[PDB]
Amino acid sequence: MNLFSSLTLVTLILLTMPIAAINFNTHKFTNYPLYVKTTISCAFITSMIPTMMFIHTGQEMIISNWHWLTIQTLKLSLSFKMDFFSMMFVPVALFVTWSIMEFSMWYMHSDPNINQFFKYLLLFLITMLILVTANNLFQLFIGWEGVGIMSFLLIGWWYGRTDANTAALQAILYNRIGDIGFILAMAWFLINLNTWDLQQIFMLNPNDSNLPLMGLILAATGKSAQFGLHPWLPSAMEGPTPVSALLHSSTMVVAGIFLLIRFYPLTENNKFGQSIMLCLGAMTTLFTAMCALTQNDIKKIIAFSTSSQLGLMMVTIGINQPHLAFLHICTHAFFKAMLFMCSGSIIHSLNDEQDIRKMGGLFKAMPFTTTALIIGSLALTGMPFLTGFYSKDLIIESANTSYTNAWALLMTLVATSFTAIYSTRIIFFALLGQPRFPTLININENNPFLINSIKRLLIGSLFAGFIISNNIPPMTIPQMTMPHYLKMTALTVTILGFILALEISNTTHYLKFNYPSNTFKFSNLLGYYPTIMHRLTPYMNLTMSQKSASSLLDLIWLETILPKTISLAQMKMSTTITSQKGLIKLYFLSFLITILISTTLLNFHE
Amino acid sequence: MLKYIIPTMMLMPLTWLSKNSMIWINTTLHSLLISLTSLLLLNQFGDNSLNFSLTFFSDSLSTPLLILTMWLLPLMLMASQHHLSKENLARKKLFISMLILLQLFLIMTFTATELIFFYIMFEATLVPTLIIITRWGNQTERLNAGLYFLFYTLAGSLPLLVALIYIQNTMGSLNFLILQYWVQPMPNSWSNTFMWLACMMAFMVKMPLYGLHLWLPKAHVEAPIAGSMVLAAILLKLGGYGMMRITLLLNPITDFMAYPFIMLSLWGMIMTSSICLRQTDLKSLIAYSSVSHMALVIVAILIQTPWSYMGATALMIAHGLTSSMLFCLANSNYERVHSRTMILARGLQTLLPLMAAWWLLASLTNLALPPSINLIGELFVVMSTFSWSNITIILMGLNMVITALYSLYMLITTQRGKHTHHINNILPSFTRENALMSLHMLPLLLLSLNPKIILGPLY
Amino acid sequence: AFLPSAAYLTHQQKVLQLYKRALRHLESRCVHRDKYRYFACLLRARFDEHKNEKDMVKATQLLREAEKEFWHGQHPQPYIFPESPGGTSYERYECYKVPEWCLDDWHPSEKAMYPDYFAKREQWKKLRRESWEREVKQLQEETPVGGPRTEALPPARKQGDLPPLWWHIVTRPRERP
Amino acid sequence: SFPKYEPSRLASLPTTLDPAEYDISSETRKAQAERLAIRSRLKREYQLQYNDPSRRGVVEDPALIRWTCARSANVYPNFRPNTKTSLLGALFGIGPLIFWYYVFKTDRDRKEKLIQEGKLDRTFNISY
Amino acid sequence: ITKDMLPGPYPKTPEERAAAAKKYNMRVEDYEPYPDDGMGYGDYPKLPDRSQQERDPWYDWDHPDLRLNWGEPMHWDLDMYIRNRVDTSPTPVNWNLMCKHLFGFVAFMLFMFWVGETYPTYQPVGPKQYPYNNLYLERGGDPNKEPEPVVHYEI
Amino acid sequence: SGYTPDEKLRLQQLRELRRRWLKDQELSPREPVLPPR
Ligand SMILES: CCCCCCCCCCCCCCCCCC(=O)OC[C@H](COP(=O)([O-])OC[C@H](O)COP(=O)([O-])OC[C@H](COC(=O)CCCCCCCCCCCCCCCCC)OC(=O)CCCCCCCCCCCCCCCCC)OC(=O)CCCCCCCCCCCCCCCCC
Numbered sequence A: 001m002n003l004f005s006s007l008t009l010v011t012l013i014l015l016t017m018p019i020a021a022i023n024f025n026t027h028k029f030t031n032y033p034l035y036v037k038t039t040i041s042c043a044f045i046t047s048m049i050p051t052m053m054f055i056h057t058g059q060e061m062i063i064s065n066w067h068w069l070t071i072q073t074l075k076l077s078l079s080f081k082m083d084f085f086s087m088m089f090v091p092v093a094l095f096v097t098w099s100i101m102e103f104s105m106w107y108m109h110s111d112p113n114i115n116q117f118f119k120y121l122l123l124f125l126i127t128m129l130i131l132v133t134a135n136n137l138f139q140l141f142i143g144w145e146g147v148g149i150m151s152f153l154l155i156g157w158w159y160g161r162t163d164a165n166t167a168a169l170q171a172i173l174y175n176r177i178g179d180i181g182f183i184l185a186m187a188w189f190l191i192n193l194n195t196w197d198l199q200q201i202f203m204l205n206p207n208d209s210n211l212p213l214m215g216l217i218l219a220a221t222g223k224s225a226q227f228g229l230h231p232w233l234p235s236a237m238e239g240p241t242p243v244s245a246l247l248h249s250s251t252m253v254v255a256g257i258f259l260l261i262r263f264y265p266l267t268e269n270n271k272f273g274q275s276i277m278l279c280l281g282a283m284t285t286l287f288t289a290m291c292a293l294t295q296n297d298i299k300k301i302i303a304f305s306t307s308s309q310l311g312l313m314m315v316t317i318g319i320n321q322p323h324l325a326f327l328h329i330c331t332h333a334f335f336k337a338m339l340f341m342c343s344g345s346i347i348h349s350l351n352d353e354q355d356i357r358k359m360g361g362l363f364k365a366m367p368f369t370t371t372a373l374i375i376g377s378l379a380l381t382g383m384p385f386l387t388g389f390y391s392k393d394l395i396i397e398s399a400n401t402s403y404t405n406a407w408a409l410l411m412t413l414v415a416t417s418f419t420a421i422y423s424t425r426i427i428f429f430a431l432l433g434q435p436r437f438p439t440l441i442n443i444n445e446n447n448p449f450l451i452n453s454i455k456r457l458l459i460g461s462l463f464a465g466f467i468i469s470n471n472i473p474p475m476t477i478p479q480m481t482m483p484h485y486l487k488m489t490a491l492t493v494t495i496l497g498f499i500l501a502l503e504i505s506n507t508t509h510y511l512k513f514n515y516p517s518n519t520f521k522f523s524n525l526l527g528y529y530p531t532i533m534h535r536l537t538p539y540m541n542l543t544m545s546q547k548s549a550s551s552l553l554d555l556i557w558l559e560t561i562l563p564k565t566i567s568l569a570q571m572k573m574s575t576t577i578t579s580q581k582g583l584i585k586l587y588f589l590s591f592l593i594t595i596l597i598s599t600t601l602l603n604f605h606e
Numbered sequence B: 001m002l003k004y005i006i007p008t009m010m011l012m013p014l015t016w017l018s019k020n021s022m023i024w025i026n027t028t029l030h031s032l033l034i035s036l037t038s039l040l041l042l043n044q045f046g047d048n049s050l051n052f053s054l055t056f057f058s059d060s061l062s063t064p065l066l067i068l069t070m071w072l073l074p075l076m077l078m079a080s081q082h083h084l085s086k087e088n089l090a091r092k093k094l095f096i097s098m099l100i101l102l103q104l105f106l107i108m109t110f111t112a113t114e115l116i117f118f119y120i121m122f123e124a125t126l127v128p129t130l131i132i133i134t135r136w137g138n139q140t141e142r143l144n145a146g147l148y149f150l151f152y153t154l155a156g157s158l159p160l161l162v163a164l165i166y167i168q169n170t171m172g173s174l175n176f177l178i179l180q181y182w183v184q185p186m187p188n189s190w191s192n193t194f195m196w197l198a199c200m201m202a203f204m205v206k207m208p209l210y211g212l213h214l215w216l217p218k219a220h221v222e223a224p225i226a227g228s229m230v231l232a233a234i235l236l237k238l239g240g241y242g243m244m245r246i247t248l249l250l251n252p253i254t255d256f257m258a259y260p261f262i263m264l265s266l267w268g269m270i271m272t273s274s275i276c277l278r279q280t281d282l283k284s285l286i287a288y289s290s291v292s293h294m295a296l297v298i299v300a301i302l303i304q305t306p307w308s309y310m311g312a313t314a315l316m317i318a319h320g321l322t323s324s325m326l327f328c329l330a331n332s333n334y335e336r337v338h339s340r341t342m343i344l345a346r347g348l349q350t351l352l353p354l355m356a357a358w359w360l361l362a363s364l365t366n367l368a369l370p371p372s373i374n375l376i377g378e379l380f381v382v383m384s385t386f387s388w389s390n391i392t393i394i395l396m397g398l399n400m401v402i403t404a405l406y407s408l409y410m411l412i413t414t415q416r417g418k419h420t421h422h423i424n425n426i427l428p429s430f431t432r433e434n435a436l437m438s439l440h441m442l443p444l445l446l447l448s449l450n451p452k453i454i455l456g457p458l459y
Numbered sequence C: 001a002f003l004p005s006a007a008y009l010t011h012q013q014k015v016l017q018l019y020k021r022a023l024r025h026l027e028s029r030c031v032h033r034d035k036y037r038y039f040a041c042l043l044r045a046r047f048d049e050h051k052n053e054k055d056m057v058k059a060t061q062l063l064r065e066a067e068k069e070f071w072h073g074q075h076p077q078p079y080i081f082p083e084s085p086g087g088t089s090y091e092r093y094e095c096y097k098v099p100e101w102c103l104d105d106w107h108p109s110e111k112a113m114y115p116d117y118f119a120k121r122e123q124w125k126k127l128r129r130e131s132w133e134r135e136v137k138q139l140q141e142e143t144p145v146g147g148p149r150t151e152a153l154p155p156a157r158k159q160g161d162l163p164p165l166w167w168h169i170v171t172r173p174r175e176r177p
Numbered sequence D: 001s002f003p004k005y006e007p008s009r010l011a012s013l014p015t016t017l018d019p020a021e022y023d024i025s026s027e028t029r030k031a032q033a034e035r036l037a038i039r040s041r042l043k044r045e046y047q048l049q050y051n052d053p054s055r056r057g058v059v060e061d062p063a064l065i066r067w068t069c070a071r072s073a074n075v076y077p078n079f080r081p082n083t084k085t086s087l088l089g090a091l092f093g094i095g096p097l098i099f100w101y102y103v104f105k106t107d108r109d110r111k112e113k114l115i116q117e118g119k120l121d122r123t124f125n126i127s128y
Numbered sequence E: 001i002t003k004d005m006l007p008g009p010y011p012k013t014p015e016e017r018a019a020a021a022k023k024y025n026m027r028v029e030d031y032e033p034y035p036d037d038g039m040g041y042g043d044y045p046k047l048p049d050r051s052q053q054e055r056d057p058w059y060d061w062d063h064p065d066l067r068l069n070w071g072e073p074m075h076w077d078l079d080m081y082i083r084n085r086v087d088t089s090p091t092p093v094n095w096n097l098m099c100k101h102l103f104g105f106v107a108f109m110l111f112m113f114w115v116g117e118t119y120p121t122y123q124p125v126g127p128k129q130y131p132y133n134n135l136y137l138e139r140g141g142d143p144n145k146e147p148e149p150v151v152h153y154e155i
Numbered sequence F: 001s002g003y004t005p006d007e008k009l010r011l012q013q014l015r016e017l018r019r020r021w022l023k024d025q026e027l028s029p030r031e032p033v034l035p036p037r
C-alpha cells in the first residue's frame, strides 16, 4: 500500500515541479527542454512501479487525500482512482510524451519561445493525468477543460497566423458543445444519485440512465471528434507537429473514448446507449476514413486516420467490449504518435513542406523515417503480431461475432479497408516513386534527438501490443470460436484494400487525364461539412446577433418602449403645460371653469 | 461594523490633509490596511449570523461582498491615478473622496440589519457613482448615461420604498433578524402580486434584468475606470444581495411570480452573449458580458434552492473580480491607443507578452475554467436550474458555448494576429498596470483553494 | 480588376493569369513530373492555337469559355506553396515580426547590451528625419492636382535624396526573425 | 456542355466567371480609374502620416470611427417604427419568451403532477 | 473627427447622396445605401457582402491581417466578415449540390443504421448460460427471497 | 513589357537601402555586452 500510493502521487508532483521551475525563474535556463524531457522520463520510471504491482496482483486504491469542499451532502475531495485504466494509461502517455518531447527538442529548436512550448506541453500532460486519474466528475471536468484550453493554446501557437486562431476557436467551439452533454451528465448524477464520485454511481447503478449516457455520448462526440462534432480535429493540424503528435493523435483525443470506457458499468446495462455508440462510431470511422482517401496534406491524412480510429474505438465500446477499446487506446498511441513524428521529419527535411504531391524518393534519402513510417503504417493497418494487431484484430473478431447492428459492422469493415488504402497512399506519395520536392536537397535526419525519439516509439510499435496483451488480466470472455471466413475477416479486407489501392496508385502514372467525379469532390472537400456548416451556422448566428439582438432589440426596441417613449411623453406634457400666452384673462377664465367643475361636476361643496 | 466605518471616514482627512504628491500613496496604503482588517468578518457560525449591534450584522452572504468591497478601493485608486494625473489637486481629492464615500455607503449597505437602512444606503450609492460618471467620464455620452443610471434605479426603487414602509406598518419591523421569525406566507392576490413587483423590480434593475439593462452598457462604458470597476464589481451585486434578503418575505407567491423573470433572464443570457459576439467596443463587450453573467444570478435567486444561492453568491464574487480585471485590461489598452474600438489595436501579444498572459487568464476565468470559483458558481447554478427543469440545460449549455466564443474572440481580436502598423505609442506595461492585474487575478485564483468562504449563508 | 499600379487588367494579362492557374491546377491533378510535363505541353499547344488571334471579341469569348473550362476542371485542393496565402506555413512568422520602433522603448541597461547596434541605429533615425521634409516636398511638387491617379511612388531624382516614403519599406522585418 | 456555377450568398461568383469583369467600355474604364484615384489619394494620405518620424501615436481612421458610430450611436436616430420593424421586434423580441415560457411551464406542471402523485422516482434526490 | 464626417440620416436628394458618397470616400455611382425601411442604417453604404478572404492577398494592404485599407469604407459587418469568421469565397462545387449531397449522405446513413438496427446480425448460438439460477445472489438478489430455479442441462 | 525606368530606379534605390539596413542588422563580435554574472 505504501509504495503504490507514494509513487502514484510522486509521478504527478514530479510533473508539476518544472511548472514551479519555469515560474520561479530569473535567468535564461540551462536547457529547460532537456529538464522537462528528463523529468517526464523519470516520471515514466516512477509510474512503472505501480503498474508492475498492478500486473502482479491487480492492486487498486483510491487516494482521497484532500477534502476540498462539502456542499451539504456532496463531499468533494481531491480523489485519485488508481485502477486498471490509470495504471495502463499513465505509463503509455508518459512514454509517448517523453518521445514527443525529445522530438520537440529537434523540431521546435529554432523557435525562440521553446520554453513556453515545453511549459504548455507539460501543462497538457498534467491536465491529462488529472483527467485519467480522477475519481469524481468535478476533477475529471478540471482535466477535461484543462486539455481543452491547452488544445487552444497549442493549436494557436503561431498566433500571427489567422488559420491557427480560427482552428483553435473552432476546437473550443466543438469541445464546449460536448461540454454541454458533460455538464448534463454531471447534473443528472447529482440530482438523481447525489454524487459525482464514480463509486456511488456504480454502486447505486441506475436503470433509467438513458439521458446521462446521452450526455456522455455528446461529451465523447465533442472530445473524441465523432461525427457531427468531428471537423475540429483536422483543423487542429494547424499547430506545430509535436502538438498534433501528442495531443491530437494519441493523448487528448482519446479522452471522450476514455470517458465512455470509464462508465462501462453503466454502458453495459443500456442497449440503447450501446446502439447509439455503435452507429455513431461506425458513421465516424466510415466518413473520416472516406475523407482521408483523397487528401494531399499529410497531417490531414493522419488526422483523419486518428479520427477513423476513434470511430473504431467508439464501435468497440458499442459492442460491450470496453477493455478492448482501452487496449486499442494504449495500442494506438505508439504508432500514431510515431506516424506524426515521421511525417514531421519529412516536413522538416523538405523545408516545411506538408503536401504529399511534393515528396517521393524518400525510401533511400530518409531511410530511418521510411523504416519507421512503414512499420507504423503496418501497425495501423493491422499487420499480424505488430502492436496494432493485438487490439484491432480482436475488435474485428468481436464486432463480427456479436449481436450487432449489421450496417455498423459493414461500415466498420469498409473503414478497415480504407485504412489500408490511405496508409499506402502515405507510403506511395511520401516515400516511393521519384522526387517532386524542390531542387536544393537539405534532407537530413541525423540528430540523435530525432533518431532516439523515433526509436523508442518504434520499439513500442513492435512490441507494446504483445507486452500489454500478455500483461493485462482477463476482464471479459474473449470470443475465440468463429467460422474461418469470420476469423479471417480483417486480414482479407485489409489485403483487398492494399490491392485496390495498389491498382489506384499505379493508375496514377498513366498518361490519362480525367475530370474529377462527384465522389472525388465529395471525398476531397471533406464531405462538404466544414464547407457548409462553418459558413452557414456562423452566418445565421452572427446575422442574428447583430441584426436582431444588438440592433433591433437592444438599441431600438428595448430603448424605445421604456425610456424613449416616456421621455417624449413627459416632453410633450411639459410643452402642453408651459405653452401659456401670459394672458391674465385666460388664467382667471380657467379659474372660473375650475370653480364650476368643483361645484357642479365634482361636488366638493357637498 | 463600526471598526470598518470609522477608518473609512478617517480616509477623508487622510486624503485632504495629505501632501500633494502623497494623496495616492496614503489612501492606497490605508485602504489596503482596511482590506487586511476586513478578514475579521470571517467569524461565521453554522447556526447564527455574526450579529454586531441593533444596526449592523454580517452573515456569510454579506461578508464576501464586504471583503470584495474593501479590497476594491485600493485597486480603484491604482487604476484611476494615471488618467487623473494631470487633474487639479482639489478635483483629484474630490474623486478620491467620491470613491471613499461610495465604499463607506457600500460597507454599511451590506451590513444593514434593518431594511429601510438598507434602502437609504442602497440609494445613497447612486450619488457618488453619478458624480464619478458624469464628472470624470471621458466622452460626451456620460451625461446621458448618468441620466439612464439615475432614472432606471429610482424608477425601480421608489415603489420599493412604499413596499418596505408597508411591511414596516404590517409586520411592525423591517429588521431582517426579526423577519426571519415573523415571516408570514404571502398568498395569491393582485395586492401581493404588486407587492412582489415593488419588492423585486428595483433589484431587477440593479442586477440588471434583460430588457431593463439599458442603463448598463452606457454607464459602464462612459464611466472612468474606477467607476467601471465599482459598477461591475459591487453595484450589480447590491441587487442580488437585496433579492436574497427580500425573497424571504415573498413566499409562496415567488413560486409563480418568478416565471416571467426566469424566462427573461434565461433568454437574456443567450441574447446578451450573442450581443457580445458582435461588439466593436471592447468596453461594451465587457458590459454585455456582465449582463449575461448576472442573468444566471437572477435565475438562481428566483428558483431559491440552496445550491442556487451558493452558486449565485460564488458567481457574484467571481464575476466582481473577473469583470473588474477585464475593465482594467481594457483601460490598459485604452491608455495607449486612446480608442475603445476593439479591432484597432491588434496583435498585442507580440508587443506586451505578460499583459497578454493577464488577458489569457481573465478570459479563462470569464469562460469559467475549472476549478475557478467562476466555474463553481456557474456549475452550481446549472445544477440547481437542471433540478428546476431538465430543459434549462439546453439554454445553459448554449450560453456556455457562446460565452467561451466571445471570451476567446476578445482574446484573439485584441492579442493575436498581425499587429496594427500605424500604432507606435504602445508603451511597455507599467508596474502599476501589472500590479493591478495581479491584485485582481491572484485572489481570484487563491479562492479556488478554499472556496467555502464565498458560498453564502447556507454552505 | 484590382491592382496597385493599373486600374484594370488587360486581356493579355488575363490570358497569362489563366495560363498560370491552369498549369498549377494541372500540376495538382497530374502529380508525377513526366505526366505533368506531357499534359503541360498539350496545354501549351491549346494556348498556342488561338494565340495569333487579332479579333478582340473572339479572343474575349475564347478567354471566357476557357475560364469556364478551368472552373469545371480545377483541383479542389490545389497545391499551394507554404508561404503562399492558403499554404500551411503562410503568415506563420508574423508573431515574430516585431516592428523597429519597439527598440526605442527599451531600457538603457539592455541598450547597453548592444552598443554598436543602437549607435548604428541612431544614424539611420537621423538619416530618416533629415530625408523626410525633402521627400514630402518632393511628393507635393510631382503629384498633379486632384491627388495621385495611381498608387505608384516616384523615385528620388537628386543625389543625396532618398526615395520618398522609404522607411517602412526598408526597415520592414525579415521573413525569418 | 459544362454545369454552370450557381453563386450563393455564402459562396459568391468568381471574378473569372463574372460577365461584368470583361467590359472594355469607357464608362467602366473611367469608373475603375476613379476608384484607383480615390484609393491612391487615400493611400497617399495614410502613408504620409504613417512614415512620419515626428508622429508617435495612432493614425486615426475616420472610416473606422464612422463605422463604429454607424454600428452603435446612429442606429436609433435612423429608426422609424413601421410595419417591418414592429413585426420583427414582436417576433424576435417576445416570441422566444412566450415559447420558452410555455415549454418550461408545461414541463414543470408535468413534473409537479408526477411528484405530488408519487410517480416521479425521487429516491436518492436530496441535493436540490 | 467632427460632425460632418459622421454618418447621418438616409439621403433623399441627389446632392445629399453625393455629399454622403464624398463622406464615405467612394464614387457617387458606386455608393448605394441600405434601403430606408427604418432598420437604422442611415446613409451607410451597402458594400457587396464579401468576406475579407476574397480580397487580394498579394496586394500591399494597409491592414494586412484584415486585407483592408486606410480610409476605405468598411462593410457594416466587417467584424463578421473577418478571416477568423464567415467566408463567402467561391467554392469548387455549387452550394445547392453540396447541400443535396451532404443531406442525402447523412439521411441515407441514418436510414441504413435504422434498417440494420431493425435487421441485426448475430451468431448461430443460444444465450449465454450462468450457474446459480442465472447468478441470483451475484446480480444483487436478496437472500431472504428464494428465486425460481433456473436449471441448465448438458447438450 | 516589364517595369518603367522610374520603377526600376526606385527598386534599385530601395534595394540598396534595404541591403544597408540588413547589413547593419548584424552583430558586433563584442555584442551582446553582458553584465557580470
Ligand atoms: C496559499 C498558498 C498557495 C500556493 C500555491 C498557489 C496556487 C496558484 C496561484 C496562482 C498561480 C498563477 C499565478 C501566476 C501566473 C500569472 C502571471 C504570469 O503569467 O506569470 C508567468 C511568469 C513566468 O512566465 P514568463 O515567461 O517569465 O512571462 C510570462 C510570459 O511572457 C507569457 O506567459 P505565458 O502565457 O507563457 O504563461 C502563462 C501560463 C499560460 O497557461 C495557461 O493559461 C494555462 C492554464 C490553464 C490550463 C491548465 C490548468 C487547468 C487547471 C488545473 C490546475 C488546478 C487544479 C489542480 C489540482 C488537481 C486537480 C483537481 O499560465 C501559467 O503558467 C500559470 C500556471 C498556474 C496555472 C493556474 C491556473 C490558471 C488558469 C486560469 C484559472 C483556472 C482555474 C483556477 C485554478 C486555481 C488553482 C489554485 O510567472 C512568474 O514569474 C510567477 C510569479 C509569481 C506567481 C505567484 C503565484 C501565487 C501568488 C499568491 C500569493 C499569496 C499566497 C502565497 C503563495 C505564493 C506561492 C508562490
Ligand SMILES: CCCCCCCCCCCCCCCCCC(=O)OC[C@H](COP(=O)([O-])OCC[N+](C)(C)C)OC(=O)CCCCCCCCCCCCCCCCC
Pocket (backbone or CB within 6 Å): A065, A066, A067, A068, A069, A076, A077, A078, A079, A136, A138, A139, B371, B448, B449
Ligand atoms: C515544496 C513545498 C511542499 C511542502 C514542503 C515543506 C513540508 C515538508 C513535508 C511535510 C508535508 C507537510 C505536512 C503535512 C501536510 C498537511 C497535512 C494536513 O493535514 O493538511 C491539512 C489538509 C488536508 O486535508 P483535510 O481534510 O485535513 O483538511 C481540509 C480542510 N477542511 C476540512 C476545513 C475542508 O490540507 C492540505 O494538506 C493542503 C494540501 C492540498 C494539496 C492539494 C492542492 C490542490 C490545488 C488545487 C485546488 C483546487 C482543486 C479543486 C478540485 C478538487 C477535487 C474536487
Ligand SMILES: CCCCCCCCCCCCCCCCCC(=O)OC[C@H](COP(=O)([O-])OCC[N+](C)(C)C)OC(=O)CCCCCCCCCCCCCCCCC
Pocket (backbone or CB within 6 Å): A566, B152, B155, B156, B159, B162, B163, B166, B191, B192, B194, B195, B197, B198, B201, B202, B205
Ligand atoms: C423600473 C421602472 C418600473 C418599476 C416598476 C416597479 C414595480 C411595478 C409595480 C409597482 C406598484 C406600486 C407599488 C406597490 C406597493 C405595494 C404595497 C402594498 O401594500 O400593496 C398592496 C396594496 C393593497 O392595498 P392596501 O394595502 O391598502 O390594503 C390591505 C390589503 N388588502 C387589499 C388585502 C386588504 O396594493 C395597493 O394598494 C395598490 C398596489 C398597486 C399600485 C398600482 C399603481 C402603480 C402602477 C405601476 C407603476 C410602475 C412604475 C411606472 C413608472 C416608471 C417610470 C416612468
Ligand SMILES: CCCCCCCCCCCCCCCCCC(=O)OC[C@H](COP(=O)(O)OCCN)OC(=O)CCCCCCCCCCCCCCCCC
Pocket (backbone or CB within 6 Å): A163, A166, A170, A173, A177, A180, A214, A217, A218, A221, A227, A228, A229, A235, A530, A531, A533, A534, A535, A537, A538, A541, A542, B394, B397, B398, B401, B405, E083, E084, E085, E086, E087
Ligand atoms: C449524440 C448527439 C450527437 C450530435 C452531433 C451533432 C450536434 C451538432 C450539430 C452541428 C452544430 C455545430 C457545428 C456548427 C458550427 C460550426 C462553427 C465552426 O466550426 O466555425 C469554424 C469557422 C471557420 O472554420 P473553417 O471554415 O474550417 O476555417 C478554415 C479557414 N477559414 O469559424 C468561424 O466562422 C467563426 C465562428 C464564430 C462564431 C460562431 C457562431 C456559431 C455558434 C454555434 C453554436 C451552436 C450551439 C449548439 C447548442 C446545442 C444545444 C443542445
